Design a protein around this ligand. Structure first.
Ligand SMILES: CC(=O)N[C@@H]1[C@@H](O)[C@H](O)[C@@H](CO)O[C@H]1O
Ligand SMILES: *[C@@H]1O[C@H](CO)[C@@H](O)[C@H](O)[C@H]1NC(C)=O
Ligand SMILES: *[C@@H]1O[C@H](CO)[C@@H](O)[C@H](O)[C@H]1NC(C)=O
Lengths: 247, 261
């Protein structure tokens, strides 16, 4: 599996990992005028999961299953155990981690659900090396108190980073300096709007690249920038792939 | 479903030096000319895009006024265009009449100018940002070895240096005309060489040229479409202090960049 291990964690290896994760997710992607790959859709369940390995500082490994349709975590495995989100595709448990003791987590893979169950938001959840490592550990042992925040960390540092070069670069800044951060409005507005940006970009094919609705992306000075077309480099040099939305 | 087929959107069109596309004096007669003018909230700078490839202000259609280059772009009764294929906007912000292939251009030595339909050479003065937010986007530009582009030698040169937050010369203003400007001297633009002996990218006075038009591509390059080449770090070696224009090639990583705003 594509993998990242804490013993070989540099800005260079992280960057390579994210580069390759994008490549694997965009196999068979469709392309429009913007030239930003659109994830596959209506993927047969047997082909719908991309597995990635994360290893912590104890040489303990988890295998996360990513839904290649939406670049979200569906489930993971730690040793002979596995854990599935409530809203994982109903048949996923017959396709992945079949030779394990399978468990259902009683919450959805959405930020909204994870934040509710854990009692804590992304804006107060630090990101950085200690946190990436600790999150693999908390998932490996499935320490229920730390599982929600562990997903907030890993979803953002792996998946949201794959979705957005801006977020990848934030994480790179953090690794290089071993300086932890909480996501600001810039990072959160990209996370919040991935689906909406996907819709607008694809919809815009019929309006000379102009969107049906504007999307607000914050910069690092907390100023909102209105993106109402494909002609904004903060979108087109940033969003690495899209959710399938339009015929 | 219906969100995939927006029926219209009203927005602004900005370009050369951050000015807006403007029906001069908000005049509505057929053939009323369009100019560049400082951006504001006036109705004669509101352009509505429709799925028929028309672009409209004050109820009338943006249009070229001649088949050959050098005549004004105007507004005119949209019924005059019923049997016309209209405007096509490229992913890089070139606005083209589909039939004639002429492109919307701010051609004069000044920004305070009539807009005309000209032959496309991918000049900065032929680059447009369609969008309501017309301001330059302030950003760092990150390249090889995770470094930041920095304006150097009293804003005449540019190369990669370790990123330092708030270091003034590492900030760039991305303008609507696809120029990359020194953030605290927005009369200066990142420019491909004007000397054919050199491939070195430098900083020069903004002049609307092909040399100064840059496109951040989905594939991670900074492209000069007119010169069919991309920004690259000389020898993939940041310590040489040289960024050059090169043909696109995936041999190293020196052609990869992104924006960190
Ligand atoms: C070659 C060509 O198509 N030229 C037409 C011209 O005949 C017409 O008068 C004008 C106004 O609609 O549009 C353009
Ligand atoms: C979780 O997602 C499911 C769909 O799989 C939905 O029915 C449910 O309402 C969601 N839960 C919450 C509270 O978001
Ligand atoms: C495009 O150019 C053709 C030929 O010059 C002209 O007939 C037509 O009116 C133009 N359309 C627009 C929208 O500029």
């Amino acid at each position: 599996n594509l993998s990242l291990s804490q013993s070989n964690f540099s800005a260079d290896t992280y960057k390579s990992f994210i580069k390759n994760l994008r490549k694997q997710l965009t196999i068979g992607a469709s392309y429009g005028s913007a030239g930003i790959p659109i994830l596959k859709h209506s993927v047969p369940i047997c082909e719908r999961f991309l597995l990635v390995d994360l290893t912590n500082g104890d040489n303990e490994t988890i295998t996360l299953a990513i839904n290649v349709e939406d670049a979200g975590f569906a489930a993971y495995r730690a040793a002979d155990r596995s854990y599935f989100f409530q809203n994982a595709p109903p048949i996923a448990s017959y396709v992945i981690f079949t030779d394990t003791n399978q468990n259902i987590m009683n919450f959805n893979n959405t930020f909204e659900s994870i934040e509710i169950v854990g009692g804590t938001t992304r804006s107060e959840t630090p990101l950085g090396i200690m946190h990436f490592e600790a999150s693999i550990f908390h998932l490996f042992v499935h320490d229920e108190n730390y599982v929600p925040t562990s997903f907030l960390v890993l979803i953002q540092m792996v998946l949201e980073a794959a979705k957005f070069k801006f977020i990848e670069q934030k994480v790179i800044h953090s690794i290089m300096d071993m300086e932890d951060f909480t996501p600001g409005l810039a990072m959160l507005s990209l996370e919040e709007n991935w689906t909406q940006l996907s819709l607008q970009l694809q919809a815009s094919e019929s309006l000379n690249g102009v969107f049906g609705d504007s999307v607000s992306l914050y910069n690092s000075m907390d100023e909102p920038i209105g993106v109402d077309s494909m002609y904004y480099p903060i979108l087109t040099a940033n969003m690495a792939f899209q959710l399938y939305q339009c015929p | 479903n219906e969100q995939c087929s927006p029926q219209q959107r009203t927005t602004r069109i900005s370009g050369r030096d951050g000015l807006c596309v403007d029906v001069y004096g908000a005049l509505t007669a057929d053939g009323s000319r369009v100019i560049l003018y400082p951006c504001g909230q006036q109705q004669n700078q509101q352009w509505t895009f429709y799925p028929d490839n028309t672009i409209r202000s004050l109820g009338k259609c943006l249009a070229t006024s001649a088949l050959s280059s050098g005549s004004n772009v105007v507004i005119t009764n949209c019924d005059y265009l019923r049997y016309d294929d209209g405007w096509m906007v490229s992913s890089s912000g070139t606005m083209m009449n589909k039939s004639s292939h002429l492109v919307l251009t701010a051609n004069a030595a000044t920004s305070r100018t009539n807009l005309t339909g000209e032959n496309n050479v991918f000049a900065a003065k032929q680059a447009w940002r369609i969008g309501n937010y017309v301001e330059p986007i302030v950003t760092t530009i990150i390249g090889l070895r995770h470094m930041c582009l920095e304006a150097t030698d009293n804003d005449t040169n540019v190369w990669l240096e370790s990123c330092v937050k708030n270091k003034t010369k590492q900030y760039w203003a991305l303008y609507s005309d696809d120029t990359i400007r020194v953030n605290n001297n927005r009369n200066l633009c990142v420019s491909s060489s004007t000397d054919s002996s050199s491939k070195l990218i430098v900083i020069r006075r903004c002049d609307g040229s092909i040399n100064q038009r840059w496109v951040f591509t989905p594939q991670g390059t900074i492209s000069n479409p007119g010169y069919e080449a991309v920004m690259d770090v000389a020898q993939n070696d940041v310590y040489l202090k040289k960024i050059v224009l090169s043909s696109a090639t995936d041999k190293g990583n020196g052609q990869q960049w992104t924006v960190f705003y």
